[PDB]
Amino acid sequence: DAEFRHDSGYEVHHQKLVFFAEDVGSNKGAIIGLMVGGVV
Amino acid sequence: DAEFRHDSGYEVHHQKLVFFAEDVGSNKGAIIGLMVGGVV
Amino acid sequence: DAEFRHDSGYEVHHQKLVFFAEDVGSNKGAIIGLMVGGVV
Amino acid sequence: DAEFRHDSGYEVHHQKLVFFAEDVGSNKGAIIGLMVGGVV
Amino acid sequence: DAEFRHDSGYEVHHQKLVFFAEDVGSNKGAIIGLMVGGVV
Amino acid sequence: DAEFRHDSGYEVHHQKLVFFAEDVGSNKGAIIGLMVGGVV
Amino acid sequence: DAEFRHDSGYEVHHQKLVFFAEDVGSNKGAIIGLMVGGVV
Amino acid sequence: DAEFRHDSGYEVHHQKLVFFAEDVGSNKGAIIGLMVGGVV
Amino acid sequence: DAEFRHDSGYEVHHQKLVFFAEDVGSNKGAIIGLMVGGVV
Amino acid sequence: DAEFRHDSGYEVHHQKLVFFAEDVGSNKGAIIGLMVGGVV
Amino acid sequence: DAEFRHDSGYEVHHQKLVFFAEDVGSNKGAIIGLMVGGVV
Amino acid sequence: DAEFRHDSGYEVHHQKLVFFAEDVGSNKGAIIGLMVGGVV
Amino acid sequence: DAEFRHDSGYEVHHQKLVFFAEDVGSNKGAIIGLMVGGVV
Amino acid sequence: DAEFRHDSGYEVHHQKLVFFAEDVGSNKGAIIGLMVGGVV
Amino acid sequence: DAEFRHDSGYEVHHQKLVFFAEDVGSNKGAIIGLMVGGVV
Amino acid sequence: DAEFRHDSGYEVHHQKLVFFAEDVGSNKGAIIGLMVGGVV
Amino acid sequence: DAEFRHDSGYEVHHQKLVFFAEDVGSNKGAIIGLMVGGVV
Amino acid sequence: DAEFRHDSGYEVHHQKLVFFAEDVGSNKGAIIGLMVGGVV
Amino acid sequence: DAEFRHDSGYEVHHQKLVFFAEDVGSNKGAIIGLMVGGVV
Amino acid sequence: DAEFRHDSGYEVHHQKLVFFAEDVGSNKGAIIGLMVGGVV
Amino acid sequence: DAEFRHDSGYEVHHQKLVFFAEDVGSNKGAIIGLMVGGVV
Amino acid sequence: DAEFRHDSGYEVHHQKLVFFAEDVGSNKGAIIGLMVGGVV
Amino acid sequence: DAEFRHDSGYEVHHQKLVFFAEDVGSNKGAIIGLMVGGVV
Amino acid sequence: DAEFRHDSGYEVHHQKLVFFAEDVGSNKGAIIGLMVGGVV
Amino acid sequence: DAEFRHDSGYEVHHQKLVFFAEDVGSNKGAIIGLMVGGVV
Amino acid sequence: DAEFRHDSGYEVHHQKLVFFAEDVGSNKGAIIGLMVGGVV
Amino acid sequence: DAEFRHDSGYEVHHQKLVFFAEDVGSNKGAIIGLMVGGVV
Amino acid sequence: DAEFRHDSGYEVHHQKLVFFAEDVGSNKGAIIGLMVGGVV
Amino acid sequence: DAEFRHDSGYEVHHQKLVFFAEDVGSNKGAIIGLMVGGVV
Amino acid sequence: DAEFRHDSGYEVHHQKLVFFAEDVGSNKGAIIGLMVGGVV
Amino acid sequence: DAEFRHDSGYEVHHQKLVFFAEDVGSNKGAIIGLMVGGVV
Amino acid sequence: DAEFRHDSGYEVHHQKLVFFAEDVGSNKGAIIGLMVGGVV
Amino acid sequence: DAEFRHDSGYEVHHQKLVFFAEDVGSNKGAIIGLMVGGVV
Amino acid sequence: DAEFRHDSGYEVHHQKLVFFAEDVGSNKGAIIGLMVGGVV
Amino acid sequence: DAEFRHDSGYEVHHQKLVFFAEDVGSNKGAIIGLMVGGVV
Amino acid sequence: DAEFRHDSGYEVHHQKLVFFAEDVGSNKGAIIGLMVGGVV
Amino acid sequence: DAEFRHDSGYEVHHQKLVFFAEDVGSNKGAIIGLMVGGVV
Amino acid sequence: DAEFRHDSGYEVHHQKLVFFAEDVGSNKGAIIGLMVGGVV
Amino acid sequence: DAEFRHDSGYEVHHQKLVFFAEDVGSNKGAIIGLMVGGVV
Amino acid sequence: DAEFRHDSGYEVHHQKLVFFAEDVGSNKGAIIGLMVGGVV
């Protein structure tokens, strides 16, 4: 995207498991079926 | 998006499990079927 | 969106489980079926 | 995207497991089915 | 993309496992089915 | 891409395993099915 | 691409293993099926 | 590419193993199926 | 390519093993199926 | 290529093993299937 | 190619083993299947 | 090639073994299947 | 080729073994299957 | 070739073994299958 | 070739063994299968 | 060839053994299978 | 050939052995299978 | 040949053994299978 | 040949052994299988 | 031959042994199988 | 869908223009945020 | 859906324009926010 | 989809223009955010 | 899909233009963000 | 896909133009972000 | 795919132009970001 | 693929032009970022 | 592939031009970034 | 591949031009970044 | 390949031009960056 | 390859021109960057 | 290769020109950068 | 190769010209940069 | 090679010209840069 | 080679010209840079 | 070689010209740069 | 060689001209640069 | 050589001219630069 | 040599000219630059 | 030599001219530059 992202960690006293999945999905811009510049 | 995101952690005294799934879904912009610039 | 988001953690004394799913769903912008610039 | 990203670590006292999957999905720009510059 | 990225490490007191996967997916630019410069 | 990337390491008190895989997927530029400069 | 990359190491107190795989995938420029300069 | 790259090492107190693989994949330039300068 | 590359070493207190493989893959320039200067 | 390369060593306190394999793969220039200067 | 290369050594306190293999692969110039200067 | 190459040694305190192989592979110039100066 | 090469030695405190094999491979100029100056 | 070469030695405190093999491979000029000055 | 070569020695404190083999391979000029000055 | 060569010695404190084998290989000029001045 | 050669000796403090085998190989000029001044 | 050669000696403090063999090989001029001045 | 040769000696402090073998090999001029001044 | 040759001695301090074998080999002029001044 | 579709044309006495766009929209199956097979 | 669709044309005596956009909208199946198989 | 489609043409007495765009939109199967086989 | 498609043409009395674009859009199978076989 | 396709032509009394683009879009199988066989 | 395709032509009374492009887009099989056989 | 293809021609009364481009796009099999057989 | 292909011609009354390009694109098998047989 | 191909011609009443290019693109087998048989 | 190929001609009433280019592109078999039989 | 090929001609009533270029491209077997039988 | 080839001619009523080139390109077997039997 | 080849001619009513060039290119066997039987 | 070859002629009613050039290119066996039977 | 060859002629009604060139290229056996039977 | 060859003639009704050139090229056996039976 | 050869003539109704040149080229056995029976 | 040869004549109705040249070139046995029975 | 040769004549109805030149070239046995039975 | 030779004549009807030149060339045995039975 036209902007950024961020993340942060820091400590813990025991075991830690982390799973991260960002932005699942097709589109982030524009989807166009058909465009016509001009007819007659 | 034209804006950013953020996250934060910090500590804990025992085991921690974390699962993250951001922005599930197709679109973040525009979907359009068809456009006509001008007819007759 | 044109606005950001945030999250926070902090500690606990025992095991903690977290599951997060943000913005489930297709659209965040505009959906258009058909547009006509002008006829006759 | 026209913007960057970031990440952060820092220490912990025991074992840590991390799994990261950035931007899963087809499109980040524009998809066009068919475009016509002009007809008659 | 038109912008860069970043990452960060730092130490820990015990074993750490890290798995990283950036930008899984087909497109980061523009996909065009067919384009016509002009007809009659 | 038209921009660079970065990474960072630093020490740790015990064993560390790291696996890195950037930019999985076909396209980073433009894919065009067919283009016509002009017809009649 | 039109831009460079970077990496960083630094020390550690015990054994470290690193595996690096950069830019897996076919395309980094332009792929064209067929282009026509002009017809009639 | 049209830009350079970089890497960095530095020391360590115990054994280190490194495996590196840059730019796996077919294309870094342009692939054209068929191009026509002009027809009739 | 139209630009250079770089690498760096430096010392270590114990044994180090390094394996390096740069730019694995067929193409770094242009591939053309067939090209026509002009027809009729 | 149209640009140069570089490498660096420096000392170490114990045994070091290095294996280097640059630019694996067929092409670094242009591959043409068939080209026609002109037809009728 | 149209540009040179470089390498560097320097000392070490214990044994060192080095294996080097530059530019494995067929082509560094141009490969043409068939070219036609002109037909009718 | 149309440019030169270089290498460097320097001392060491214990034994050193070096194996060096330059430009393994068939081509450094141009390979042509067949060329036609002109037909009818 | 149209350019020269270089190498360098310098001393060492213990035994050194060196093996050098430059430019292994068939071609360094031009290979042509068949050429026709002109037909009809 | 159309250019020259070079090498360098210098001293050493213990035994040294060197093996040198320059320009392995058949061709350094031009190989032609068959050439025709002109037909009809 | 159309250019000369060079070599250099200099002293050493202990024994040295040297083996040198230059330009192994058939051709340094031009190889032609068959040439025709002109046909009909 | 159309250019000369060179070599250099200089002293040494202990025994030295040298073996020199220049230009192993058949051809330094031109090899022609069959040449035709003209046919009909 | 059309050019000369050179060599150099100079002293040494202990025994030295030298072996010199210059230009091993059949051809230094031109080899022709068959040449025809002209046919019909 | 069409050019001369050279060699150089100079003294030595201990025994020296030299073996020299110049231009081993059949041809230094032109070898032709057969020639035809003209046919019909 | 059409040019001369040269050699050089000078003194020595201890025993010296020299063996010289110049231009071993059959041909130094031209060898012709058969030649025809003209046929019909 | 068409040119001369040369050699040099000079004083020596201890025993010296020299062996010279100049231009061993069959041909120094021209060898022809058969010549025909003209046929029919 | 688990069912097919259909279309029909037939004639007209003058010019006819038709534009068709089937099934505008993201989904035809199922979109779900998250599932849990079982907890404690 | 589990049902098919249909369309029909037939003729008219003058110009006719038709624009058709079927099933505009995201969902045709089922959308689920979160589902739990069972807790305690 | 698990079912097929169809289309039909037939004749007309004058010019006809037809534009067709089937199934614009991301999904025809299943999209899953995250699934868990079982926890504790 | 698990089913086929179809199309039909047939003749007309004057010029006809047809443009066809089937199945524009990313997905036709299954997209999964992350799946877990089992945890504790 | 697991099924085939079809097309049909047939004649027409005047000029006809046809443009066909089948299955534009990234995916036709399955895309998985990350899958885990089992954890603890 | 696991199934074949088809096409059909047949005649026409005047000129016909046809342009055909099949299966535009990256994937026809399976794309996986990262897979884990099992952890602890 | 695991299945074949087909095409058909047949005659026409006037000129016909055909352009065919099948299966444009990177993948027809499987693409994997990283796979792990098993960890601890 | 694991299956064959086909094509068909047949006659025509006037000139015909055909251009055919099969299977443009990188992959027809499997592309793998990195695989691990097993770790600890 | 593991299967064959085919083609067909047949006659025509006037001139015909044909241009054919099969399987343009890098890969028909397997491309692997790196493989590990086993670690610890 | 592991299967054969085929082609067919047959007659024609007027001139015919044919150009054929099979299997353009680098690879038919297997390309491997680096393989490891086993580590510790 | 492990299989053969074929071709066919047959007659024609007027002039015919044919140009054939089989299997343009580097590889038909296996290309290995570097392989290791085993380490420690 | 491990299999043979074939070709066929047959007659024709007027002039025919044929130009044929098989297997243009470097490799038909195996190319290996470097192989190691075993290390420690 | 490990198999044979074949060709065929047969008659023609007017003039015929044929040009044949089989297996143009460097390698038909195995090319190895460097091989090691075993190290320590 | 380990196999033979073949060719065939047969008659013709008018003039015929044939040119044959088999197996252009350097290698038909094995090329090795350097081989080591064993080290320490 | 380790196998024989063959050729065939037969008659013709008018003039015939034949030019034949077998196996142009340096190597039909083994070319080795350097071999080492064993080191320490 | 380790096998024989063959040729065939037979009659003809008008003039015939034949030119035959077998095995042009340097090597039919083995070429070795330098071989060592054993070192220390 | 270790095998024989053959040739054949037979009659002809008009004039015939034949030119034969067998095995042009330097080597039919083994060429060795330098061999060592054993060192220390 | 270690094997014999053969030739054949037979009659002819009109004039015949034959020119024959066997085994042009230097070597039919073994050529050795320098050989050493043993050193220290 | 170690084997014999052969030839054959037979009659002829008109004039016949024959020219025979066997084994032009220097060597049929062994050529050695210099050989050493043993050193120290 | 160690074997004999042979030739054959037989009757002729008209004038016949024969020219024979057997085994032209320097060597039929062994040529040695210099041989040493033993040193020190």
Author numbering:
A (entry chain d), B (entry chain c), C (entry chain 6), D (entry chain e), E (entry chain 5), F (entry chain V), ...: 1 to 40
What did the publication describing this PDB structure actually write?
The pathology of Alzheimer’s disease (AD) is primarily characterized by the fibrillization and deposition of amyloid-β (Aβ) in the brain. Aβ is generated through the cleavage of a precursor membrane protein by β-secretase and γ-secretase, resulting in the production of the Aβ40 and Aβ42 isoforms. Particularly, Aβ40 fibrils exhibit considerable variability in protomer conformation and consequent fibril morphology, likely due to the lack of C-terminal stabilizing interactions compared to Aβ42 fibrils. In essence, fibril morphology is determined by the balance between intra- and inter-protomer interactions, depending on various intrinsic and extrinsic factors.
